[PDB]
Design a protein around this ligand. Structure first.
Ligand SMILES: O=C(O)c1ncsc1NS(=O)(=O)c1cccnc1
Ligand SMILES: [Zn+2]
Ligand SMILES: [Zn+2]
Ligand SMILES: [Zn+2]
Length: 231
């Protein structure tokens, strides 16, 4: 039942409920002649919603809001981008125009600015050092160290035992390293150890792209990252 690229036309977005008040959002983008899905997270916070990541572009992110409005009916008041790449900040200006307060770490904001990508408005303090955690309404935010990018955050929903690894965690079907141009391959496995060591209790692990699993996805990512390092 977890939505795949076969069910989703580029431009559309599917929500998938994972627990009481916890959803993933799924969108697709056309990249290098292939079609690839992407995951973000939606977490209920009283009578409002926190959004983790854009749906990878302005048009998808407009559809994401329309899909949230239709299917959940609570307002998105805050959004957090988990690193500076386009699949996480692309659509921030859409969010901002709809009244969403947009957030990222200063590291992410600076890299976004340097990259010419969209820049979330608000700064998340207290995440500058590997192993830092901060609370953010109904989630904890964790900086595990450099991995997929130097700024990548992971998000844990203490109340549903949901860990959203964003692009620092790979799905099981992904057996070769993705876009590593901005990655710290030397530190990635240590960063994942930090995630393992902080969230030993997670039950649902959502990778940046593709199918959820359990904690095995962390070891899976490590294996793939090491294989790539030994190419
Ligand atoms: O690995 C990532 O997080 C990532 N995010 C957007 S694209 C990408 N990796 S990728 O460019 O190597 C990719 C994988 C599969 C199909 N097309 C592109
Ligand atoms: Zn990325
Ligand atoms: Zn504001
Ligand atoms: Zn990605």
């Amino acid at each position: 039942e977890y939505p795949t690229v076969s069910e989703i036309p580029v431009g559309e977005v599917r929500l998938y409920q994972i627990a009481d008040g916890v959803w993933s959002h799924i969108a697709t983008q056309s990249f290098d002649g292939a079609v690839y899905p992407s995951n973000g997270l939606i977490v209920r916070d009283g009578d409002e919603l926190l959004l983790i990541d854009t749906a990878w572009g302005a048009k998808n992110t407009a559809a994401l809001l329309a899909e949230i409005e239709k299917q959940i009916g609570l307002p998105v008041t805050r959004a957090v981008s988990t690193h500076f790449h386009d699949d996480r900040v692309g659509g921030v200006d859409v969010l901002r125009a709809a009244g969403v307060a947009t957030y990222a770490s200063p590291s992410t904001r600076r890299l976004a600015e340097v990259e010419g990508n969209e820049i979330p408005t608000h700064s998340l303090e207290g995440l500058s050092s590997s192993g830092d955690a901060v609370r953010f309404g109904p989630v904890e935010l964790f900086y595990p160290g450099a991995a997929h990018s130097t700024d990548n955050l992971v998000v844990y929903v203490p109340s549903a035992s949901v860990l959203y690894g964003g692009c620092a965690i790979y799905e099981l079907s992904r057996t070769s390293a993705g876009n590593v141009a901005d990655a710290d391959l030397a530190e990635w496995p240590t960063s994942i150890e930090r995630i393992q060591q902080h969230y030993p209790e997670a039950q649902f692990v959502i990778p940046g792209h593709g199918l959820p699993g359990g904690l095995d996805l962390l070891k899976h990512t490590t294996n793939v990252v090491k294989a790539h390092t030994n190419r």
